[PDB]
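Q: Please design a sequence for this.
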């Protein structure tokens, strides 16, 4: 599925991301925009044997198990295929873990490069929340 901006914002709000660990909703929407272009099926296969999965491009070395990645930790305790669903629940639950495991949103390269320091409220402006 390719989400709309406001539709994704509402889904992320329903799942408790607004102000999760001090990150406003627009940060999460911005991260998804630049990680995956709002596409739940996005995959990026890296040369290091790992793959980034889903709307938040969560990597298979630390966070989910795909059976193919060296050094797997599976800290979210999920198969990576769960991150390719049309429903965002598994991606949101794992994203919450990423931040709870002592990372901030700097764990997402697209957040740090394209969202940090910007007016991230723009990403939820105009939306029914």
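A: Design:
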């Amino acid at each position: 599925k390719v989400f709309g901006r406001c539709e994704l914002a509402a889904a992320m709000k329903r799942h408790g991301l607004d102000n999760y660990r001090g990150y406003s909703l627009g940060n999460w929407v911005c991260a998804a925009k630049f990680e995956s272009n709002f596409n739940t099926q996005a995959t990026n296969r890296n040369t290091d044997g790992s793959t980034d999965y889903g709307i938040l491009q969560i990597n298979s070395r630390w966070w989910c198990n795909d059976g193919r990645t060296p050094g797997s930790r599976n800290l979210c305790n999920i198969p990576c295929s769960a991150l390719l669903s049309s429903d965002i629940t598994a991606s949101v639950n794992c994203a919450k873990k990423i931040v709870s495991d002592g990372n901030g949103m700097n764990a997402w390269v697209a957040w740090r490069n394209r969202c940090k320091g910007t007016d991230v409220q723009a990403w939820i402006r105009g939306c029914r929340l």
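Q: Thanks. Anything notable?
A: Residues 1-129 form a domain with the Lysozyme fold (CATH 1.10.530.10). The beta strands are 43-45, 51-53, 58-59.
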